[PDB]
Design an enzyme around this catalytic site. Structure first.
Site, PDB file in Angstrom:
ATOM      1  N   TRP A  85       1.866  -5.248  -9.166  1.00  0.00           N
ATOM      2  CA  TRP A  85       2.932  -6.169  -9.552  1.00  0.00           C
ATOM      3  C   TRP A  85       3.162  -7.171  -8.432  1.00  0.00           C
ATOM      4  CZ3 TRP A  85       3.672  -0.853  -9.372  1.00  0.00           C
ATOM      5  CH2 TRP A  85       4.265  -0.355  -8.199  1.00  0.00           C
ATOM      6  N   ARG A 126       0.792  -1.234   0.000  1.00  0.00           N
ATOM      7  CA  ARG A 126       0.000   0.000   0.000  1.00  0.00           C
ATOM      8  C   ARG A 126       0.823   1.282   0.000  1.00  0.00           C
ATOM      9  NH1 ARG A 126      -3.771  -0.818   5.055  1.00  0.00           N
ATOM     10  NH2 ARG A 126      -1.958  -2.039   5.745  1.00  0.00           N
ATOM     11  N   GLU A 156       4.636 -14.614  -3.632  1.00  0.00           N
ATOM     12  CA  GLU A 156       3.308 -15.052  -4.037  1.00  0.00           C
ATOM     13  C   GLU A 156       3.381 -16.121  -5.111  1.00  0.00           C
ATOM     14  OE1 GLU A 156       0.390 -11.551  -4.390  1.00  0.00           O
ATOM     15  OE2 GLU A 156       2.317 -10.561  -4.725  1.00  0.00           O
TER      16      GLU A 156
HETATM   17  C1  HEM Z   1       1.508  -2.343  -6.302  1.00  0.00           C
HETATM   18  C2  HEM Z   1       1.912  -3.602  -6.133  1.00  0.00           C
HETATM   19  C3  HEM Z   1       1.219  -4.509  -5.090  1.00  0.00           C
HETATM   20  C4  HEM Z   1       1.828  -5.444  -4.360  1.00  0.00           C
HETATM   21  C5  HEM Z   1       3.343  -5.784  -4.343  1.00  0.00           C
HETATM   22  C6  HEM Z   1       0.820  -6.074  -3.511  1.00  0.00           C
HETATM   23  C7  HEM Z   1       1.042  -7.083  -2.597  1.00  0.00           C
HETATM   24  C8  HEM Z   1       0.062  -7.805  -1.951  1.00  0.00           C
HETATM   25  C9  HEM Z   1       0.201  -9.112  -1.330  1.00  0.00           C
HETATM   26  C10 HEM Z   1       1.473 -10.008  -1.228  1.00  0.00           C
HETATM   27  C11 HEM Z   1      -0.983  -9.443  -0.812  1.00  0.00           C
HETATM   28  C12 HEM Z   1      -1.272 -10.776  -0.093  1.00  0.00           C
HETATM   29  C13 HEM Z   1      -1.802 -11.585  -1.276  1.00  0.00           C
HETATM   30  C14 HEM Z   1      -1.794 -13.064  -1.050  1.00  0.00           C
HETATM   31  O1  HEM Z   1      -1.138 -13.494  -0.083  1.00  0.00           O
HETATM   32  O2  HEM Z   1      -2.433 -13.800  -1.844  1.00  0.00           O
HETATM   33  C15 HEM Z   1      -1.940  -8.389  -1.105  1.00  0.00           C
HETATM   34  C16 HEM Z   1      -3.273  -8.366  -0.741  1.00  0.00           C
HETATM   35  C17 HEM Z   1      -4.234  -7.470  -1.169  1.00  0.00           C
HETATM   36  N1  HEM Z   1      -3.980  -6.424  -2.050  1.00  0.00           N
HETATM   37 FE1  HEM Z   1      -2.118  -5.651  -2.512  1.00  0.00          FE
HETATM   38  N2  HEM Z   1      -0.423  -5.496  -3.797  1.00  0.00           N
HETATM   39  C18 HEM Z   1      -0.206  -4.532  -4.778  1.00  0.00           C
HETATM   40  C19 HEM Z   1      -1.184  -3.736  -5.339  1.00  0.00           C
HETATM   41  C20 HEM Z   1      -2.501  -3.709  -4.943  1.00  0.00           C
HETATM   42  C21 HEM Z   1      -3.546  -2.877  -5.519  1.00  0.00           C
HETATM   43  C22 HEM Z   1      -3.290  -1.878  -6.679  1.00  0.00           C
HETATM   44  C23 HEM Z   1      -4.690  -3.153  -4.867  1.00  0.00           C
HETATM   45  C24 HEM Z   1      -6.121  -2.592  -5.015  1.00  0.00           C
HETATM   46  C25 HEM Z   1      -6.453  -1.621  -5.887  1.00  0.00           C
HETATM   47  C26 HEM Z   1      -4.397  -4.166  -3.878  1.00  0.00           C
HETATM   48  C27 HEM Z   1      -5.333  -4.676  -3.026  1.00  0.00           C
HETATM   49  C28 HEM Z   1      -5.163  -5.759  -2.239  1.00  0.00           C
HETATM   50  C29 HEM Z   1      -6.193  -6.376  -1.450  1.00  0.00           C
HETATM   51  C30 HEM Z   1      -7.632  -5.795  -1.480  1.00  0.00           C
HETATM   52  C31 HEM Z   1      -5.637  -7.432  -0.781  1.00  0.00           C
HETATM   53  C32 HEM Z   1      -6.238  -8.466   0.226  1.00  0.00           C
HETATM   54  C33 HEM Z   1      -7.745  -8.454   0.397  1.00  0.00           C
HETATM   55  C34 HEM Z   1      -8.181  -9.226   1.615  1.00  0.00           C
HETATM   56  O3  HEM Z   1      -7.872 -10.440   1.709  1.00  0.00           O
HETATM   57  O4  HEM Z   1      -8.861  -8.599   2.468  1.00  0.00           O
HETATM   58  N3  HEM Z   1      -3.060  -4.483  -3.942  1.00  0.00           N
HETATM   59  N4  HEM Z   1      -1.257  -7.401  -1.786  1.00  0.00           N
HETATM   60  C1  LIG Z   2      -3.203  -6.088  -6.914  1.00  0.00           C
HETATM   61  C2  LIG Z   2      -2.411  -7.198  -6.250  1.00  0.00           C
HETATM   62  C3  LIG Z   2      -1.029  -7.266  -6.425  1.00  0.00           C
HETATM   63  C4  LIG Z   2      -0.325  -8.305  -5.812  1.00  0.00           C
HETATM   64  N1  LIG Z   2       1.019  -8.410  -5.928  1.00  0.00           N
HETATM   65  N2  LIG Z   2      -0.967  -9.251  -5.101  1.00  0.00           N
HETATM   66  C5  LIG Z   2      -2.306  -9.214  -4.916  1.00  0.00           C
HETATM   67  C6  LIG Z   2      -2.923 -10.215  -4.173  1.00  0.00           C
HETATM   68  C7  LIG Z   2      -4.297 -10.188  -3.972  1.00  0.00           C
HETATM   69  C8  LIG Z   2      -5.017 -11.245  -3.202  1.00  0.00           C
HETATM   70  C9  LIG Z   2      -5.776 -10.994  -2.061  1.00  0.00           C
HETATM   71  C10 LIG Z   2      -6.429 -12.053  -1.429  1.00  0.00           C
HETATM   72  C11 LIG Z   2      -6.343 -13.349  -1.935  1.00  0.00           C
HETATM   73  C12 LIG Z   2      -5.598 -13.596  -3.085  1.00  0.00           C
HETATM   74  C13 LIG Z   2      -5.478 -14.989  -3.660  1.00  0.00           C
HETATM   75  N3  LIG Z   2      -6.724 -15.330  -4.370  1.00  0.00           N
HETATM   76  C14 LIG Z   2      -4.945 -12.542  -3.709  1.00  0.00           C
HETATM   77  C15 LIG Z   2      -5.032  -9.172  -4.524  1.00  0.00           C
HETATM   78  F1  LIG Z   2      -6.364  -9.181  -4.337  1.00  0.00           F
HETATM   79  C16 LIG Z   2      -4.425  -8.187  -5.295  1.00  0.00           C
HETATM   80  C17 LIG Z   2      -3.053  -8.190  -5.491  1.00  0.00           C
END
Ligand code: HEM
Ligand SMILES: Cc1cc(N)nc2cc(-c3cccc(CN)c3)c(F)cc12
Ligand code: HEM
Ligand SMILES: Cc1cc(N)nc2cc(-c3cccc(CN)c3)c(F)cc12
Ligand SMILES: C[C@H](O)[C@H](O)[C@H]1CNc2nc(N)[nH]c(=O)c2N1
Ligand SMILES: C[C@H](O)[C@H](O)[C@H]1CNc2nc(N)[nH]c(=O)c2N1
Ligand SMILES: [Zn+2]
Lengths: 415, 415
Positions: free
Chosen positions: B285, B116, B290
């Site tokens: 990205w 974030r 992951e």
């Molecule tokens: C910019 C590069 C980003 C990186 C490196 C990143 C990284 C991550 C990672 C590692 C997770 C845990 C995912 C998993 O374990 O499956 C995650 C969760 C999440 N990401 Fe980020 N993300 C990025 C961008 C974004 C963006 C642009 C959004 C939304 C517009 C976003 C929204 C979310 C949400 C909503 C979750 C988890 C939702 C939940 O389980 O409540 N991410 N992200």
């Molecule tokens: C945008 C973005 C980037 C990233 N690098 N990773 C992200 C991982 C998740 C994610 C959140 C909850 C569950 C899962 C697996 N279904 C993925 C997601 F929403 C968005 C991601």
């Protein structure tokens, strides 16, 4: 009130009803989760005469129900017996068997402990007849010898007289019975264990003569019945140690690392039926990662990643070479191999987390639940390739329990 | 109400007041912590006309306060303007600028997201004028091309018409825009990605012709305004992929592994001022882990640890040889090196968790807090040697937010 925890690596589902018997509070609310606060305000520890009988009756009701004699005459006479003694003295004394039960269940209810599959095989040493620092030193030595068992480690706890007034309080000032000393240097860096730097100079304050090396085993600082604490050195033949070597890298010996065999925590408080035991050292055996990950590689500890990676000939410029992860796995392979080659009991984080899942199955079956803290159960390396990473866990506070307590040197009315 | 979170690797202390503005509930109580339940009953998603204006006024009050025009005439006219439109139509329409603000803050408030730090540089594509499955396919293609940017990845979200009645609902049935297919075999084992086995046969159900290989990119299944979903194949030149190779082990190519460059999640719901956007794919990205930890080594996924350890010539008999950990670090060094050699944006779990601590400092300063879920922030390998392992975190639910939602094929009134 019939909540469900899922495993996502097996799709196994379990039903928790034990959380209904829960009594203590967590720190979370409907609008906030504090599951990652390390020492929450509830996990720390003075009680009056009023609240003490519900706590005794609560305890005695699980105790007699557990030996297939719930509500009988022996149970009702004991309830009245404690009642009257709490009238008389405003405290009470546990039977030997009630003490063993309460201790084994404090460990059973320790949600941050991954080793609890063994909770019923705990040897309980009753030291409630102790009165002096030397007596405590004797009890602790017999504890160290018994639990170490020549490397075939055995779990044990030693229980010193319970708190009463609050000013006459037995305390082990060491955080563990066996710990390495920490010395600050002129340049500022640290020889030994940085964790104990503040304790190591309290011992020098009370008169310890420090060898000022790396792995110097600290002395014991024992406080008896509120008196000022006294220094005693554990006989070295009782402190079993493992020199750390690798089963591939011959240069690993040159590092000159070792650790003690016995993990034995002595700064915590045991609460049974409302009684507080301020000195109660308890010991088991190590999971490998507690040494090779936290002890050896925490930044604020021995911090040996850079010198292991040097000798490994690693790409140490870029963070994304994962040279840190790469040297961390070698260090943990070395600790495991070392303890095993020397026949000192140790468990790896794979076997211990598979055992805890197995334990969780048994507690949801024959107890209706297992309080468990994911933040602490998941090992500090390779989390997702161990089965506890995928196992949802309900945390809740049951009693008898182990609680944290302030350090005696910040609370003792000195002299 | 002025709670404090500590870092234990630096002794840095931060004061959270932002949790005061919190509105949604967590699932925890005073007597239970559910911080490790994966899909809590609160994190999932129908609202009437009554509750909708507090939600709009709540939203618009942070929006105008954020552009240095709190409570002015432009704010009071907009409150009345939405009020009257919620009288008229019992719903309302967001301004273009209110949509961009609400989307960027849904990501800002995502406590499980370690990325974030970048929350303010999110490109928002307004697709609220869309009406057909083909129109959605066009919007999604333009999204994939823009965000991929030839490997120089850029964050983006595409926002389809909001829910209104509930039966006319835009949905992307894919869990991600780019996913590999999963095929069950005669013997029972799985070719491709096991995670998608149920979705892969829904596409064959609707008429997909499967190449039946390993890394077959699934088609899109797009539902427009409640109608039945339709299949479309993303033009292959728009799907950027990285073949996975090691910078030491030449045999690593033989494994024949690859992954897509673009992580773009499409099954979640965006909530802004009480309005629900059921289709809103968003992309960033990858953090290396992951792919190399969860995707490649989860038991229920590609599960390649045994064949990597074979070719590494590893002690695979004993669990405590840590052959699993040892092969896990090589796989993650390979994914990082591969993406970087190809100039596809990727981040390692060390750099991303150092960035999140940096982010936490900024949110406690210029916002008074940062909702954060430790269970999810801590990377799935080498937890304790990254700075987030030692950082206490307060989790609480703020709005605008992203929420989970049921799969459309278990809730759609079909045809
Ligand atoms: C910019 C590069 C980003 C990186 C490196 C990143 C990284 C991550 C990672 C590692 C997770 C845990 C995912 C998993 O374990 O499956 C995650 C969760 C999440 N990401 Fe980020 N993300 C990025 C961008 C974004 C963006 C642009 C959004 C939304 C517009 C976003 C929204 C979310 C949400 C909503 C979750 C988890 C939702 C939940 O389980 O409540 N991410 N992200
Ligand atoms: C945008 C973005 C980037 C990233 N690098 N990773 C992200 C991982 C998740 C994610 C959140 C909850 C569950 C899962 C697996 N279904 C993925 C997601 F929403 C968005 C991601
Ligand atoms: C039998 C072998 C045992 C093993 C392998 C084991 C393992 C562990 C580990 C890895 C932790 C986390 C420690 C840390 O990260 O610093 C822990 C915590 C703990 N263990 Fe066990 N342990 C064992 C025996 C015991 C015994 C015998 C007791 C008590 C009688 C006990 C009580 C506790 C408590 C009370 C905590 C955490 C307290 C808290 O923070 O709330 N353990 N254990
Ligand atoms: C008995 C036992 C065995 C073991 N293998 N490990 C143990 C770890 C702790 C422990 C709990 C909280 C903090 C700390 C670090 N001070 C240690 C403990 F109490 C007892 C342990
Ligand atoms: C049981 C547990 O809640 C579940 O496996 C969670 C744990 N933490 C996680 N953390 C991340 N980043 N991603 C995940 O899928 C999970 N899974
Ligand atoms: C910030 C966090 O609460 C703290 O670092 C915890 C996390 N989980 C842990 N888990 C174990 N087993 N031991 C620990 O010391 C910690 N530390
Ligand atoms: Zn909680």
């Amino acid at each position: 009130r019939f909540l469900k925890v899922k495993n996502w690596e097996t799709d196994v589902v379990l039903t928790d009803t034990l959380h209904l018997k829960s009594t203590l509070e967590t720190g979370c609310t409907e609008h906030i989760c504090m599951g990652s606060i390390m020492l929450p305000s509830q996990h720390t520890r003075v009680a009056t005469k009023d609240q003490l009988f519900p706590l005794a009756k609560e305890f005695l009701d699980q105790y007699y129900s557990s030996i297939k004699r719930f509500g009988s005459k022996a149970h009702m006479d004991r309830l009245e017996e404690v009642n009257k003694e709490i009238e008389s003295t405003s405290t009470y004394q546990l039977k030997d068997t009630e003490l063993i039960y309460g201790a084994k269940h404090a460990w059973r209810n320790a949600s941050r402990c991954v080793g609890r599959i063994q909770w019923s095989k705990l040897q309980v040493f009753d030291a409630r007849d102790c009165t002096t620092a030397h007596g405590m030193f004797n009890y602790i030595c017999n504890h160290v010898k018994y639990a170490t068992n020549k490397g075939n480690l055995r779990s044990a706890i030693t229980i010193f007289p319970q708190r009463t007034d609050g000013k006459h309080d037995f305390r082990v000032w060491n955080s563990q019975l066996i710990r390495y000393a920490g010395y600050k240097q002129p340049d500022g860096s640290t020889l030994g264990d940085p964790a104990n730097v503040q304790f190591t100079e309290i011992c020098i304050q009370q008169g310890w003569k420090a060898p000022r090396g790396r792995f110097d085993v600290l002395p014991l600082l024992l406080q008896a019945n509120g008196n000022d604490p006294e220094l005693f050195q554990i006989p070295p033949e009782l402190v079993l140690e493992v020199p750390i070597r690798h089963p591939k890298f011959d240069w690993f010996k040159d590092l000159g690392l070792k650790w003690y065999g016995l993990p034995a925590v002595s700064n915590m408080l045991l609460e049974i039926g409302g009684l507080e035991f301020s000195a109660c050292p308890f010991s088991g055996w190590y999971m490998g990662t507690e040494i090779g990950v936290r002890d050896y590689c925490d930044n604020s500890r021995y911090n040996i990643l850079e010198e292991v990676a040097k000798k490994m000939d690693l790409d140490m410029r870029k963070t994304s070479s994962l040279w840190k992860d790469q040297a961390l796995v070698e260090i943990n392979i070395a600790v495991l191999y070392s303890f095993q080659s020397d026949k000192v009991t140790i468990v790896d984080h794979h076997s211990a987390t598979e055992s805890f899942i197995k334990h969780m199955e048994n507690e949801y079956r024959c107890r209706g639940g297992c309080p468990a803290d994911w933040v602490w159960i998941v090992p500090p390396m390779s989390g997702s390739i161990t089965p506890v990473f995928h196992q949802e866990m309900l945390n809740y506070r049951l009693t008898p329990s182990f609680e944290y307590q302030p350090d005696p040197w910040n609370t003792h009315v000195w002299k």
